[PDB]
């Protein structure tokens, strides 16, 4: 481990010594290599730049109590990137290629994986882009797959803390039959302006509703929503317009198999918020972001507290992060040791 | 003029000797320069690549009968790019900067502006992208504005010809409150898969309906729809989810001021297609693409003919292209001579 202000990293870009890069040409991926060049050199006519033919992932490497480093369910990120690629007519990066590449980046930059137990991690950003020359709208025939990395902070140093979110019905991050279930730049571009709107009213982010009818919750910025009912059920939105987070599936799994809770993907109506005794957002970067209150029109709805975080949220957070950092026994197949 | 197969260019990328490029840093655009480098060198963490923070324009330079070259309403492209930038939180490229840059590119590559009268033109592709380093979703603070060029063919060598289009209701190119009215890559990425679907059924492209209700026509691929009624009215869809083409406004204008037609932006219901004696798509690349028939569910609706093109479409096409190539007197303020 080098000497960085580990606890006070936030979540931002750092230029680390090595990234992985692989080129797709003539219907094939090359084997990939590590490069020291953090600048991409791509045609002015690259479809990633003109026609949004781009996708990314996000996953973390965690240092454990004995010093060894591990990935958490990177097979799930690979499969999500494959579905995202299909939607945008990009060639898939196979799961074994993806996971191997991720490991190569962690190993090559292992001294940047923060010490146990800062709660800090090495964040990996895989990126898949259409390059080469295309002027009429059409998929590329050349692609780049790259994974670069940066250390990121806990974000909950001081413990879990609630923040407030805004439902703002005159913005959609995705269409009903658009690219919402694909991790692509286009969805994020649409979120820039509503994000700014939320921020200027002192909310963390916007909670988006279903684009067809605007009556059901879709997601919290780029993260998934979950609610806990009085009968200790875990409920998260299910829509074909929603990005399915690895964190959400993991929480679904742990809620059931560790806590004996009914854990389902169902619709969550904005008119039934009192159904939930606790609520939060979940995702790789976020882990769990407890929701204090949600603003919708005139109304400000507080699930549990504006200052404290609920017991069930606490329990799920402790168990998920424990597994990720290796302090709690993992479900079968979830942990991928970086030196294996 | 150099020696290229002018009539048989299609619409595709060519690497010409010079492009314009200008960088935005510290809240300011530089003055711009011409460069011979057709490769962009941008951070692996550029928001254009991760968060779809990108926009483009398209406009043509036309050689006239005396050999001089001119642009057609590039002020309109500049203003559209400004609105597109606002939507994606990118700094605006001022109209005078935009038009001057376009002229510099035409002049620097003037020998690639096809001869009169091939019907071929020099296509300009301005591109505005967020670059520099950003990992959490957020606008860039560094931007590139570049304009590169390529000669493109008539596409209607053989005269205007109708093609068929498909309405396919399980895809949206944009959300009701998304980025549809902004010329950004995200909209085009969403169109890749439905485009492929259309093409494999031997249709030119998809006609998209309004994403909320799917009862009104939005646009024809990336081009605008227009219909002509039996009472010689020109009607084109108006939605806040539609990209407003310069060609559409120009056709609206000419229909009224040259042909004495009522010319309006109104809704066009998919259940009232018999309202139209002729229909087409309009845009910079397309000019006018006459629509033969439209497939919707079981039904194939032919407005005028599957093989011939209607008289009113012909008249509008002749007048618009005449103005663009300088053979017909222009409305005030439309033509921008490249050496002025």
Coordinates of N, CA, C and O in Angstrom, one line a residue, chain A residues 40-126:
Chain A
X40 N -7.0 7.8 -24.5 CA -7.5 7.0 -25.6 C -7.3 7.7 -26.9 O -7.6 8.9 -26.9
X41 N -6.9 7.0 -27.9 CA -6.6 7.7 -29.2 C -7.6 7.1 -30.2 O -7.4 6.0 -30.7
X42 N -8.7 7.8 -30.5 CA -9.7 7.2 -31.3 C -10.1 8.2 -32.4 O -10.0 9.4 -32.3
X43 N -10.7 7.6 -33.5 CA -11.1 8.3 -34.6 C -12.1 9.5 -34.2 O -13.0 9.2 -33.4
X44 N -12.0 10.6 -34.9 CA -12.9 11.7 -34.7 C -14.3 11.3 -35.1 O -15.3 11.9 -34.7
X45 N -14.4 10.2 -35.8 CA -15.7 9.7 -36.3 C -16.2 8.4 -35.5 O -17.0 7.7 -36.0
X46 N -15.6 8.2 -34.3 CA -16.0 7.1 -33.5 C -17.5 7.1 -33.1 O -17.9 8.1 -32.5
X47 N -18.2 6.0 -33.3 CA -19.6 5.9 -32.9 C -19.8 6.1 -31.4 O -20.9 6.6 -31.0
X48 N -18.8 5.9 -30.5 CA -19.0 6.2 -29.1 C -19.2 7.7 -28.9 O -19.9 8.1 -28.0
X49 N -18.7 8.5 -29.8 CA -18.8 10.0 -29.7 C -20.0 10.6 -30.4 O -20.5 11.6 -30.0
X50 N -20.4 10.0 -31.5 CA -21.5 10.5 -32.3 C -22.8 9.9 -32.0 O -23.8 10.6 -31.9
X51 N -22.8 8.6 -31.8 CA -24.1 7.8 -31.8 C -24.2 7.1 -30.4 O -25.0 6.1 -30.3
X52 N -23.5 7.5 -29.4 CA -23.6 7.0 -28.1 C -23.3 5.5 -27.9 O -23.9 4.9 -27.0
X53 N -22.5 5.0 -28.8 CA -22.3 3.5 -28.7 C -21.2 3.3 -27.7 O -20.0 3.1 -28.0
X54 N -21.6 3.2 -26.5 CA -20.7 3.1 -25.3 C -21.4 2.5 -24.1 O -22.6 2.6 -24.0
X55 N -20.6 1.8 -23.3 CA -21.2 1.2 -22.1 C -20.1 1.1 -21.1 O -18.9 1.1 -21.4
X56 N -20.5 1.0 -19.8 CA -19.5 0.8 -18.8 C -20.0 0.0 -17.6 O -21.1 -0.4 -17.6
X57 N -19.0 -0.4 -16.8 CA -19.4 -1.2 -15.6 C -18.7 -0.5 -14.4 O -17.9 0.5 -14.6
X58 N -19.0 -1.0 -13.2 CA -18.3 -0.5 -12.0 C -18.3 -1.6 -11.0 O -19.4 -2.2 -10.7
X59 N -17.1 -1.9 -10.4 CA -17.0 -2.9 -9.4 C -15.8 -2.7 -8.6 O -14.9 -1.9 -9.0
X60 N -15.8 -3.2 -7.4 CA -14.7 -2.9 -6.4 C -13.8 -4.1 -6.1 O -14.3 -5.2 -6.1
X61 N -12.6 -3.8 -5.8 CA -11.6 -4.8 -5.2 C -11.5 -4.4 -3.7 O -11.3 -3.2 -3.4
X62 N -11.5 -5.4 -2.9 CA -11.5 -5.2 -1.4 C -10.3 -5.9 -0.8 O -10.0 -7.0 -1.1
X63 N -9.6 -5.1 0.0 CA -8.5 -5.8 0.8 C -9.1 -6.4 2.1 O -9.9 -5.8 2.8
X64 N -8.7 -7.7 2.3 CA -9.2 -8.4 3.5 C -8.3 -8.3 4.7 O -7.2 -7.7 4.6
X65 N -8.7 -8.9 5.8 CA -8.0 -8.8 7.1 C -6.5 -9.4 7.0 O -5.6 -8.9 7.7
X66 N -6.3 -10.4 6.1 CA -4.9 -10.9 6.0 C -4.1 -10.2 5.0 O -2.9 -10.6 4.7
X67 N -4.7 -9.2 4.3 CA -3.9 -8.4 3.3 C -4.3 -8.8 1.9 O -4.0 -8.0 1.0
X68 N -4.8 -9.9 1.7 CA -5.2 -10.4 0.3 C -6.4 -9.6 -0.2 O -7.2 -9.0 0.5
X69 N -6.5 -9.5 -1.5 CA -7.5 -8.6 -2.2 C -8.4 -9.5 -3.0 O -8.0 -10.6 -3.5
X70 N -9.7 -9.1 -3.0 CA -10.7 -9.9 -3.7 C -11.7 -9.1 -4.5 O -11.9 -7.9 -4.1
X71 N -12.3 -9.7 -5.5 CA -13.4 -9.0 -6.2 C -14.7 -9.6 -5.7 O -14.7 -10.7 -5.1
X72 N -15.8 -8.9 -5.9 CA -17.1 -9.3 -5.4 C -18.1 -9.5 -6.6 O -18.5 -8.5 -7.2
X73 N -18.4 -10.7 -6.9 CA -19.4 -11.0 -8.0 C -19.1 -10.4 -9.3 O -20.0 -9.9 -10.0
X74 N -17.8 -10.4 -9.8 CA -17.5 -9.7 -11.1 C -18.2 -10.5 -12.2 O -18.3 -9.9 -13.3
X75 N -18.5 -11.8 -12.1 CA -19.3 -12.5 -13.1 C -20.6 -11.8 -13.4 O -21.1 -11.8 -14.6
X76 N -21.2 -11.2 -12.4 CA -22.5 -10.5 -12.6 C -22.3 -9.2 -13.4 O -23.1 -8.9 -14.3
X77 N -21.2 -8.4 -13.1 CA -20.9 -7.3 -14.0 C -20.6 -7.7 -15.4 O -21.0 -6.9 -16.3
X78 N -20.0 -8.8 -15.6 CA -19.7 -9.2 -17.0 C -20.9 -9.6 -17.7 O -21.0 -9.3 -18.9
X79 N -21.9 -10.2 -17.1 CA -23.1 -10.6 -17.7 C -24.0 -9.4 -18.0 O -24.6 -9.4 -19.1
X80 N -24.0 -8.5 -17.1 CA -24.7 -7.2 -17.3 C -24.1 -6.4 -18.5 O -24.9 -5.9 -19.3
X81 N -22.8 -6.4 -18.6 CA -22.1 -5.7 -19.7 C -22.4 -6.5 -21.1 O -22.5 -5.8 -22.1
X82 N -22.6 -7.8 -21.0 CA -23.0 -8.5 -22.2 C -24.3 -8.2 -22.7 O -24.6 -8.0 -23.9
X83 N -25.3 -8.1 -21.8 CA -26.6 -7.7 -22.1 C -26.7 -6.2 -22.6 O -27.4 -5.9 -23.6
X84 N -25.9 -5.4 -22.0 CA -25.8 -4.0 -22.4 C -25.2 -3.9 -23.8 O -25.7 -3.1 -24.7
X85 N -24.2 -4.7 -24.1 CA -23.6 -4.7 -25.4 C -24.6 -5.1 -26.5 O -24.7 -4.5 -27.6
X86 N -25.3 -6.2 -26.2 CA -26.3 -6.7 -27.1 C -27.3 -5.5 -27.5 O -27.7 -5.4 -28.7
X87 N -27.8 -4.8 -26.5 CA -28.7 -3.7 -26.7 C -28.2 -2.6 -27.7 O -29.0 -2.0 -28.4
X88 N -26.9 -2.4 -27.6 CA -26.3 -1.4 -28.4 C -25.5 -2.0 -29.6 O -24.7 -1.2 -30.3
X89 N -25.7 -3.2 -29.9 CA -25.1 -3.9 -31.1 C -23.6 -3.8 -31.0 O -22.9 -3.6 -32.0
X90 N -23.0 -4.0 -29.8 CA -21.6 -4.1 -29.6 C -21.3 -5.5 -29.3 O -22.1 -6.2 -28.7
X91 N -20.1 -6.0 -29.7 CA -19.7 -7.4 -29.5 C -19.5 -7.6 -28.0 O -19.0 -6.7 -27.3
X92 N -19.9 -8.8 -27.5 CA -19.8 -9.1 -26.1 C -18.3 -9.3 -25.6 O -17.5 -9.8 -26.4
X93 N -18.0 -8.9 -24.4 CA -16.8 -9.3 -23.8 C -17.1 -10.5 -22.9 O -17.9 -10.4 -22.0
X94 N -16.5 -11.7 -23.3 CA -16.8 -12.9 -22.5 C -16.5 -12.8 -21.0 O -15.6 -12.0 -20.7
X95 N -17.2 -13.5 -20.2 CA -17.0 -13.4 -18.8 C -15.6 -13.8 -18.3 O -15.1 -13.1 -17.5
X96 N -15.0 -14.8 -18.9 CA -13.6 -15.1 -18.5 C -12.7 -14.0 -18.9 O -11.8 -13.7 -18.1
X97 N -12.9 -13.4 -20.1 CA -12.0 -12.3 -20.5 C -12.2 -11.1 -19.5 O -11.2 -10.5 -19.1
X98 N -13.4 -10.8 -19.2 CA -13.8 -9.7 -18.3 C -13.1 -9.8 -16.9 O -12.5 -8.9 -16.4
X99 N -13.3 -11.0 -16.3 CA -12.9 -11.2 -14.9 C -11.3 -11.3 -14.9 O -10.7 -10.7 -14.0
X100 N -10.7 -11.9 -15.9 CA -9.3 -11.9 -16.0 C -8.7 -10.5 -16.1 O -7.7 -10.2 -15.5
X101 N -9.4 -9.7 -16.9 CA -8.9 -8.4 -17.1 C -9.0 -7.6 -15.9 O -8.0 -6.8 -15.5
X102 N -10.1 -7.7 -15.2 CA -10.3 -7.0 -13.9 C -9.1 -7.4 -12.9 O -8.5 -6.6 -12.3
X103 N -8.9 -8.7 -12.8 CA -7.8 -9.2 -11.9 C -6.4 -8.6 -12.3 O -5.7 -8.2 -11.4
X104 N -6.1 -8.6 -13.6 CA -4.9 -8.0 -14.1 C -4.7 -6.6 -13.6 O -3.6 -6.2 -13.3
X105 N -5.8 -5.8 -13.7 CA -5.7 -4.4 -13.3 C -5.5 -4.3 -11.8 O -4.6 -3.5 -11.3
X106 N -6.2 -5.1 -11.0 CA -6.0 -5.0 -9.5 C -4.6 -5.4 -9.2 O -3.9 -4.7 -8.4
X107 N -4.1 -6.5 -9.7 CA -2.7 -7.0 -9.4 C -1.7 -5.9 -9.9 O -0.8 -5.7 -9.1
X108 N -1.9 -5.3 -11.0 CA -0.9 -4.4 -11.5 C -0.8 -3.1 -10.7 O 0.2 -2.4 -10.7
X109 N -1.9 -2.8 -10.0 CA -2.1 -1.6 -9.2 C -2.3 -2.0 -7.7 O -3.0 -1.2 -7.0
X110 N -1.9 -3.1 -7.2 CA -2.3 -3.6 -5.9 C -1.9 -2.7 -4.8 O -2.6 -2.7 -3.7
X111 N -0.9 -1.9 -5.0 CA -0.5 -1.0 -3.9 C -1.5 0.1 -3.7 O -1.4 0.9 -2.7
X112 N -2.4 0.3 -4.7 CA -3.5 1.3 -4.5 C -4.8 0.8 -3.9 O -5.7 1.5 -3.7
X113 N -4.8 -0.5 -3.7 CA -6.0 -1.1 -3.0 C -5.8 -0.7 -1.5 O -4.8 -1.1 -0.9
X114 N -6.7 0.2 -1.0 CA -6.6 0.8 0.3 C -6.4 -0.3 1.4 O -6.9 -1.4 1.2
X115 N -5.8 0.1 2.5 CA -5.6 -0.9 3.7 C -6.9 -1.2 4.3 O -7.9 -0.5 4.3
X116 N -7.0 -2.5 4.8 CA -8.0 -2.9 5.8 C -7.7 -2.1 7.1 O -6.6 -2.1 7.5
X117 N -8.7 -1.5 7.8 CA -10.1 -1.4 7.4 C -10.5 0.1 7.3 O -11.0 0.7 8.3
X118 N -10.2 0.7 6.2 CA -10.5 2.1 5.9 C -12.0 2.1 5.4 O -12.6 3.2 5.5
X119 N -12.5 1.0 5.0 CA -13.8 1.0 4.3 C -13.6 1.4 2.8 O -14.6 1.5 2.0
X120 N -12.4 1.7 2.5 CA -12.0 2.2 1.1 C -11.6 1.0 0.2 O -11.2 0.0 0.7
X121 N -11.8 1.2 -1.1 CA -11.6 0.1 -2.0 C -10.9 0.6 -3.3 O -10.7 1.8 -3.5
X122 N -10.6 -0.3 -4.2 CA -10.1 0.0 -5.5 C -11.3 -0.1 -6.4 O -11.8 -1.2 -6.7
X123 N -11.7 1.0 -7.0 CA -12.9 1.0 -7.9 C -12.4 0.7 -9.3 O -11.5 1.4 -9.8
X124 N -13.0 -0.2 -10.0 CA -12.7 -0.6 -11.4 C -13.8 0.0 -12.3 O -14.9 -0.2 -12.0
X125 N -13.3 0.6 -13.4 CA -14.3 1.1 -14.4 C -13.9 0.5 -15.8 O -13.1 1.0 -16.5
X126 N -14.6 -0.6 -16.1 CA -14.6 -1.2 -17.4 C -15.4 -0.3 -18.4 O -16.4 0.2 -18.0

